[PDB]
Design a protein around this ligand. Sequence first.
Ligand SMILES: *[C@@H]1O[C@H](CO)[C@@H](O)[C@H](O)[C@H]1NC(C)=O
Ligand SMILES: [Ca+2]
Ligand SMILES: [Ca+2]
Ligand SMILES: [Ca+2]
Ligand SMILES: [Ca+2]
Ligand SMILES: [Ca+2]
Lengths: 394, 394, 394, 394, 394
Amino acid sequence: EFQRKLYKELVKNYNPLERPVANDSQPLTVYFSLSLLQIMDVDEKNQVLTTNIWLQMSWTDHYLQWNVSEYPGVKTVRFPDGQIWKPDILLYNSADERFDATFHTNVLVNSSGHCQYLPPGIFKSSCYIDVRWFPFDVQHCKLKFGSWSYGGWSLDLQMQEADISGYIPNGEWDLVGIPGKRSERFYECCKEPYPDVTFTVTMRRRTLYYGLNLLIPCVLISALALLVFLLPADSGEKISLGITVLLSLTVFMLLVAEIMPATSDSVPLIAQYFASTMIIVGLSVVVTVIVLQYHHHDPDGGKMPKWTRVILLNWCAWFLRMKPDLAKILEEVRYIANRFRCQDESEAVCSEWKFAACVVDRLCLMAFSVFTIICTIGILMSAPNFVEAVSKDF
Amino acid sequence: EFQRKLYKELVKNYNPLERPVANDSQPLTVYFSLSLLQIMDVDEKNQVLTTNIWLQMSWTDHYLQWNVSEYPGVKTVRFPDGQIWKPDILLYNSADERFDATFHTNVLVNSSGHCQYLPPGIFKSSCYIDVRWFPFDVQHCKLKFGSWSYGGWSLDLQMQEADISGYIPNGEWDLVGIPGKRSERFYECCKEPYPDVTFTVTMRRRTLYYGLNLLIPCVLISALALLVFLLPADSGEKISLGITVLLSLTVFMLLVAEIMPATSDSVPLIAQYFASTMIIVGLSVVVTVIVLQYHHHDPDGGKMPKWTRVILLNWCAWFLRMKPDLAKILEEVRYIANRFRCQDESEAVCSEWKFAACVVDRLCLMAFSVFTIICTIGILMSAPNFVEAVSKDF
Amino acid sequence: EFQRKLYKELVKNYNPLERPVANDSQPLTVYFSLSLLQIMDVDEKNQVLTTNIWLQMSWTDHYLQWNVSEYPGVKTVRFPDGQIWKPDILLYNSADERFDATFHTNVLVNSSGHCQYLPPGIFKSSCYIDVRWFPFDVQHCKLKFGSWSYGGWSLDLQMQEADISGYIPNGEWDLVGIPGKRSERFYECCKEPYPDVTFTVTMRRRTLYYGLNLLIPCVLISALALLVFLLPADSGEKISLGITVLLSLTVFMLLVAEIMPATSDSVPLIAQYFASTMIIVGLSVVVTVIVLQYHHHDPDGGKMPKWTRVILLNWCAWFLRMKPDLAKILEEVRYIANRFRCQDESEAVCSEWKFAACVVDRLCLMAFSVFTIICTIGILMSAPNFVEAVSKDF
Amino acid sequence: EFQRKLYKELVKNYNPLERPVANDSQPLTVYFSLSLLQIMDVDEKNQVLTTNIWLQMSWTDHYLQWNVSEYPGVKTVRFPDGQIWKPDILLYNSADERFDATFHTNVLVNSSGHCQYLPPGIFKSSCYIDVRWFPFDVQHCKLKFGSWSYGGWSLDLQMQEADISGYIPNGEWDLVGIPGKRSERFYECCKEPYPDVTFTVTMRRRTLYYGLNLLIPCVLISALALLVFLLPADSGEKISLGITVLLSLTVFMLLVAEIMPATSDSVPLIAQYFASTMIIVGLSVVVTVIVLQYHHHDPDGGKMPKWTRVILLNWCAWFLRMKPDLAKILEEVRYIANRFRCQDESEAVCSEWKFAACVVDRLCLMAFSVFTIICTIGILMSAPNFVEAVSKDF
Amino acid sequence: EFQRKLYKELVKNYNPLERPVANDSQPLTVYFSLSLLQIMDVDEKNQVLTTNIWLQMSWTDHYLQWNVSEYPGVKTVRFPDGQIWKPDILLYNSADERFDATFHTNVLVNSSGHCQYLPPGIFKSSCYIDVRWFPFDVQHCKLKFGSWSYGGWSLDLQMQEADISGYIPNGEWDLVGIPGKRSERFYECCKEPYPDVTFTVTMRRRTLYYGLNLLIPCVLISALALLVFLLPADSGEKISLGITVLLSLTVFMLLVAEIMPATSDSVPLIAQYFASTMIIVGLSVVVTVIVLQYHHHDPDGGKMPKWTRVILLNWCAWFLRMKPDLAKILEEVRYIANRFRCQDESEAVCSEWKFAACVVDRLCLMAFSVFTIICTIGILMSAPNFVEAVSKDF
Ligand SMILES: *[C@@H]1O[C@H](CO)[C@@H](O)[C@H](O)[C@H]1NC(C)=O
Ligand SMILES: [Ca+2]
Ligand SMILES: [Ca+2]
Ligand SMILES: [Ca+2]
Ligand SMILES: [Ca+2]
Ligand SMILES: [Ca+2]
């Protein structure tokens, strides 16, 4: 009976259009905060953050007060959308096609006029997602909230610290924090300033998944490329090993292509690693052609230059620790024996060329191994967060 | 005439804003339950569960009572959304972009004021989907329901057991159960506690599909890799077999990549199996290079070390059960015969090196076969539910 | 003037909440049917059917009658949603996120109160799609309609045969029929029974597309695998042909993976066909290694077992219809001649081993050809609808 | 003042439910047309057409007239949805999930009651998309509009020619025309006939994109297959070239698979072209095995049949324009010389077999080249629109 | 008290249907502009631009004025959708399925009747996206705004310069400008003209991402194809290198296929580059077959033509800087010696053919290298914006 009586009394002459202050000249203080429940998605290609949040707004309605003695037991009332004045706070940097994903719930008012409003929502927000250091990256995505049509002279927006006590951890992203800042900005539309409250979600990517699924795979497959410098040339499979690894790594680059944005602010760390690896595998194919060209050198073609004979067979090789009818019969048998001698000297020349190929193959093995290690270590450890990622995730 | 009369009488002074109790100081008891019709989707990558459910709410409306003698034949009435007070129960962990997928239906009230409300819905809910043991996994996805704006002092939410009599089986997921728990929790917003009813859908994945399409394929293709240790070196195809298997298995890992979340809570079982298999195939390629390096060893290069001569040709080989013008003519023919003898001894040296390659090839065949079996069996049987899956699905 | 007068008269005291019967104690008869215009989609992976349907409901409104003499020319009126009582019939097994895809249109009433209501819709429904016999499958998808909040005591739902006179043929699915059944079921919610009308869309898949794009391709590529048993061993390409076919067929399995659900109710027909084919190609690779192992057998290694010498060179081969200074000179020339004789006998031994490989290769060619035909024919003709599909589609 | 006065006067007793005619017995004439702005999408796989259209409806409202002398300057008024009677014209063959994509705009009425209504929309419509001649195809997609609840006795729908003056050309589709037809049809629901206006969008596909990206690529890669019949057998790469082309073309078929519907009304032109090409490449692999089988024929095996010796070495080859101690020493040297003679005759036999392989290789080169040209030209020129496509697009 | 009083006074007799002018004969001036916050997406395949914009409309409402002395402190009021007259300005070339993505916010009115309205939105617009010069392209996408139902005689639309002070840079697109133009156009619907304001977003694509991920990769992989002309023929791997590169580049074309529209207005720059490269790699395979055909030429077949002997061994080779019992014994040994001589001359003939292959291989290396450079440089530098892209992005 008292709840029915109070609801009838409170809506007498109430105008939801009217900002509920007693003195029309002063601004209404609105306290704004949020409660972050979940980070649902970090879409790097579209540059969008999806979160489950509960907005928190609280203010004082001058007209919605009563004396609890005259209504025993009725400490609070509730009003749905449209029957009560509410602040029109929107997320400025919204990426949602409706632009406002807020699910409108009740406003809870107590007997002194304090109004609480806690609409939930699945919010899509635009934030610059920097992939320069991917996958060892930290993202800072802003959520900028503010009254759309009330400037600082009418609505005095005030900030309170974000609530994370209900945050559900994300298996991919490690929540570092969510600080907030209250600013007052001027826009070209209007002489009046408009205040905003901006919360910056700082998140660290967890690198175990990409380490075991992207980085390590690539390292191992690059190592197989260097295996060509150990395969004997007579196997006749040197070129198949190298080009096969190359074809495999090309598909791998395109696999990373599906997850990275097509921006030009910087060459990402992962792009550099794949680049460096690809030229190394490609260069090994070039070297293999050179090695095969020696191993198959015609013994009756040009003559091994002195510069080759010295650099390879001596220096590099040492450094690598390698190292009447009787007369007619005599003319026929002598021709046979002489023919055997000529091929023997010819094949000796071929042995030198084959040995040169082996030396070049051993030389490039050492050089490519060093270069692969240096490029890999250098690129990965360039990231500021690489040491932290190893400690926390591995 | 009586139905028209009763509808006119019941809405006289009715206020949908008003919680329908007689004594404003006491809370209204709302009985909440659900009826699970279908598990529509388990999205492991986005971590979302889609279900077809019928919510069940029932309470007592103090104002919607009548005397059936005064309205003969009118035992029940119905009211749509907005003409009657309803509890504002939402799914807290909703992943739906509207945040509330409930389809609003009628409230059915009988002559004593008992109100029933059974809205259907396609619900999207957020739940941690653990892929540690995939595909032998059991998921526990929670659905947390509660009044949004009425605390424990006004709405007394009470739980009833979930209904599954209409459940339609899912070909992928075996419904284990759906127990419920009623809790009362405090939030930072409000001093008043808020009760919730949470139902935990426990589901077991059916492994036949992934066994025949993911696990067995991989096992067979790994076995082909070990086939290299039986292929003679003179075939000149040892490296093509191995690297081809490797390229195939790389695509297979990326196929599993499209279905798994990118989380770092644990290395999944399937990831370990693919890892172990990949290094085994990759290591077999390394061994093949060593085997070919012996088979193609130059007979005029270094000399077979004693350590090699003993470990391989004796121990390993036993264990494996392998095992004036006349004078001028004499000088020419003697050179020819001597030349033949020199190559003969040379090719004998080559035979030892070729035999060493065969022994190493046989040795690694046994070692790799053992390792492949142990790694496969060990990884699969680590899962707690592996034995159950085999019994129920195979 | 009369149309305006009649609309004013009919809405006097009309209450859309009120079931429009004269006697409140008796149920209102609602005739329900549907008109199927198109089968838009059969999603086997998500297990959802999309159709374009026109629902048909008809009943009698006791209050919406008039005397056409008093309103000359006004034979009918129309009312939109909310101004007239309507049955609240929903599709129970809806897969749509709004749960109700009905587009609300007018209710057409004639001068005796007969009301017709024919809302169109794009309906998404859940149905078990059995892929056991895919692509030779017949699907039975149910559409279950019923009043949500009116039980059998108030709304007497009655069925009429579905209309297909406007059905537009689907190029993929051959509509077999759409019979309907009216049932009355009890639910745990309520003591009152609720009637439903269920229409079962029975559709036959047209197999021409999958025959020419999925089945025949696979058959031809498997045949190329058997081609290895005709390729001479000295070509040095036996292993490349086989493993290449294997890599190709693995991609083909994953292509079928994108269209099939991940259920475990049964191993599909297409899965069995790919399985059988894959082991046959894989087994041919194993046999190729054995054949090469003979063709490259060292003549100075073990000795051809008697069991081999008899089974192959005799039985299998027949069945297959294969089949002072002068003395010093004498010692040098005799050594040369003797050396030639030793290699000659050695290469004769090699010829036997090479012939054994040829016999084994011919033997397995016949065996694999038989097995490929039997497995292919057996699997395809296991389907109950295989004969029908060939007759109608090919 | 006059605009305010007129709006107050016109809505006095206006009933949006009432069809605005003076004589209730006669039908209201509604003129229907459309303005086609853009063809947005032609989805062949889902069989849906997406367009940007402006509907045009015009009729006479008997009640919304005024005397412009009594309201100087007020020549027109406007009414939004729900305040004015409108025809309920829908697109019958809609594929949109809401079923009605019309964006509701104002109705513009002049002082004599003529009402204009031009709602814009993004319309999704179902049309049979025939891919028999793809990519040289012409599509005829219908858009069928009609009043949903007003039959021919109440609403007299009349057609006017479609407007294309604002049409924006589509880079893929060449708009041929959009004629319209007005029909009157009977439905099983109702004895009254219902008129419809149907516009048929006829569009020609532009073939430059598919010619350079789909047809020509395939032609060139098939040509490489025939290159095998020029590669010498001793290269040992004949089988790798052929099977590699085959693997490439299999992926290409699956690429076309992603864009074509899975219907069985006909085998498309593109499917036939890929079919023909695939068997040609596959058959070339079979021939390569035969050629290699001759080139590697054992000289001590069977004897070259007479039928082979004549058909190939003579006919085909001509047509192709190819073409005491002294005695002991004598026995040893005679054995050596005799041994040399035996191999010489043996290798002569091998030369004939190698030449036969060359002849067969040359023969099949000519045959396969002819067949490839004929099949390609025949298939492409079977399309009725092939000549037109070349003239307009190339 | 004054805010409540003013809201009550202003809505007395207010009619939102009425255009708020004092003199009904004159048009109402509406100032239109926009504020561009973000370019969210440029979808080249669907030809759609997605942006985050704030529309700006301002006009004068003759009825919403008051004297601020009579309402101290009340300088402004606000009205939501439907309680105030607003211009019905839509985006004409909308690609959104609702056709109007505007989020409706408040209208802010001051004491002299000046009304401001700044609705935000995520706008999808249709624009021709020219890919002729992709990835060095500049796009000009139009956004055409205008009143839908008010012509130039009633609503006088006037333009103001677009605001970009809040523009957030896009990592892919460099905003060049957003000029606007106000036009007045006649349509077939209506004799009255309708004015529009069109803003043209001009954007330059940033080429770093595609340069490092699309252009450079392709250049390097084409270079590997030319590596075949350095690989010795005896390696037996010439054909595997070439066809492998070809298979890789085919996948690369299909990767670009997923991002380009299927239009026929022009052959894109990227298509030409891939075309040119593909024929070069394919032609190198053809040349390799010719080179191998010489290297494996039978010495007893045809005779090297004079035209070949001169062009290659002399001209091209110079330009390239290449270059009683005793008698019986005599007959046996003489046969042996003569046999050795015959093979010697035979292998000399083979050496010439092998050298010819080497010369042809060297010749084509130079020719293909030149052609690859010219085609690459020519195609890339054909783009008008190529020089600008290098300067700004590299
Ligand atoms: C506004 O009101 C003040 C106080 O009543 C009065 O002095 C002033 O003249 C008014 N201005 C007008 C009527 O323009
Ligand atoms: Ca992420
Ligand atoms: Ca699942
Ligand atoms: Ca289907
Ligand atoms: Ca198309
Ligand atoms: Ca873009």
